[PDB]
Structures are given as C-alpha cells and as structure tokens.
Amino acid sequence: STPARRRLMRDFKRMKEDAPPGVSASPLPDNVMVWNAMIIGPADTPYEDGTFRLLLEFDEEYPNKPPHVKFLSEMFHPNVYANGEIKLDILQNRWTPTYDVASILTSIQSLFNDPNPASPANVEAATLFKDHKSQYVKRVKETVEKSWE
Amino acid sequence: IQMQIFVKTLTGKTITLEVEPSDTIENVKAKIQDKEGIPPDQQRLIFAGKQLEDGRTLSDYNIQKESTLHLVLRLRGG
C-alpha cells in the first residue's frame, strides 16, 4: 500500500511508544489520513496547562507536502489565525520530507515559549504581545480555561 | 444614514470613504483594500488612541462624520 500510508504508520509507531513531552496524537481507528492531536501549554508561559487540541489532515502527497493542521481549541496567539490554522514556515513555504508528526508538534509547541510577533497571523494578538503584555496574558488565560471546558 | 470619513497613512497619503455608523471595522478595511490595494491583515487602524478590532462597528468607537482614522502599514505583515 501507499508511501504516505507507510510513512504515516512510522509516525504513529513513533507517537505510540516515544512521544515528546506534553504532546500526543493518533489517527482515527478507520482513517489514517486524519489525526487528533493535543499540545499541553508548557510551563512558565501564559499558556501553562492549557489542553489545546489540533487536527492533522493528510493526503497521498505526504510526505512530499506537509499535512494541513489547525487548532480545534479556541486560541489567542500571534502566530495562529482566527480559523485555527498556524503560521509556521515548515507547514507552508519551508516544508521538507524529513519532518514527521512528532517534529511538527514540537515545532508548534515551541511557539508557546517564543512566539513570533514579527509574522502575525493574529494581529490583535501580535499587537497586545508588544504593547499590552498584561492584556495579552489575560486573553491567553481565558483561552487556557476554555481549553479545559 | 451615511457620512464621509478620511483615512490617512504615516506618509500623508489620504483617501476618502463613504461609510455608515454601523459598518464594521472589517467592512472598512475591505473598502481600503479595494481603494489602496492593501490586504486587511497588513492594516492597523487607529482612532483616538484605540486600535480598531474587527467585528466592532464605527459607532462603537464614536467615529463620527469627517473623522480621520490613522492607517499604519505593517509589511511583510504576514
């Protein structure tokens, strides 16, 4: 069967036994092209302890094209669009076939630590991040609470 | 119920728009895109110190007739 399906079972085996801290992911039972994921808000960031759910969608072009990924949880982060999609260069202009599910999620998670207000997907959020730090944190925390519920 | 407003950049370049008090900041940013070719994601609109957020209306910010909004461009802004 397909290269994509083969690459994807590798990624799964990877996530099933040796998954990075604070992140997890798995296909649907009956459709390996679609995955639920979750990233936990890392410590000492305003996002701390949030449980942010994502959706990874693949097609047969994988791994020559990145998957489509978006948060299903309400987000407030300078590099996440309103529709949940993520402005991260390895998912757009700078993808290479060496990335897998594990490494995508850890690249995303690292945005929680060091956002990039230089490339804003959420302009409201980029703005607060530079000009109203206190207001920014309060918005993030609202997001944290909603992620539980 | 309609009014003329102005939108001015930091360069001095100014356009005039006809709007209504109940148009949204999003609607206004689209008109600007059409009139100056700038994608709404690269626009920052300021009026009386407050930055204007989408899904609020002009009347909300008390933008009345003949008001001038300040447009700040952020490139690459993406």
Author numbering:
A (entry chain A): 2 to 150
B (entry chain B): -1 to 76
Paper text:
Rad6 monoubiquitinates histone H2B at K123 in conjunction with the E3 ligase, Bre1, a modification that is important for transcriptional activation and elongation as well as mRNA splicing. Rad6 also plays a role in DNA repair, monoubiquitinating PCNA in a reaction catalyzed by the Rad18 E3 ligase. Yeast Rad6 promiscuously polyubiquitinates all four histones in nucleosomes in the absence of an E3 ligase and human RAD6B can form free polyubiquitin chains.
In the crystal, Rad6 iso∼Ub conjugates form a network of interactions. The largest of the interfaces is between Rad6 of one conjugate and ubiquitin in another, which comprises an interaction area of 446.1 Å2 as calculated with the PISA server. This region of yeast Rad6, however, does not mediate any contacts in the crystal. Mutations D31A, N37A and L56A significantly decrease polyubiquitination of nucleosomes.
